[PDB]
Structure formats: C-alpha cells, structure tokens
Amino acid sequence: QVINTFDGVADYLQTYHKLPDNYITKSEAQALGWVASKGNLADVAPGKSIGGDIFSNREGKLPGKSGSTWREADINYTSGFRNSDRILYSSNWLIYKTTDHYQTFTKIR
Description:
Layout: H1 6-16, E1 23-24, H2 26-32, H3 41-44, E2 49-55, E3 70-74, E4 86-89, E5 95-98, E6 106-107
C-alpha cells in the first residue's frame, strides 16, 4: 500500500525520521513535468505526492522552538489537482494537520 494518510505519514515521520518513498519535493515534481494548473501530477509522477518542502511559518500559526524548522507534505493525494490536506512536521517531530489549505492547524502528535 501507499503511505499517504494522516496516521500513516504521522507514524512514519516519528519513527523513521523522514517521509516515505512516495514523497517528492515541488521542485522535483516540476522538473518531471508537473504543471499545477493542469493538475497532471499523477500523470507525470505516478504514485507520488508533493512533500518535504520547508513551510515558512511567518504568520506564527505553528509553535516554533527557537531553532526549529517546519516541513510540509500533501496528505490523501492520489490524482488530479492537489487537495487542501497537509501534514506539518517540525525539527523535533511535532506533527500538525491542516485540511483547509494552511488556514488552521491542529496537533495530531
């Protein structure tokens, strides 16, 4: 099976300290041919979801420890345009969720 659910990815991150093999950055996706406005990710990178890019967190929505960095990954993606579901994970593996395109977050771990 493909690890792309909230619990599946949350557990993987906290245990393996990295995203599963089905995640690729936006820049890797783009170089493969992903064109956001065409929603072709599943055509150009079968089985992959966007994940691993740094999330800025300038709006102070997520709780940053002094030297921590936040990263994000798409959740529940299989085909077409990207959805609004994302998993947010910190340097010390704090896990947050958003289902409203980064408007609001809730802790899941």
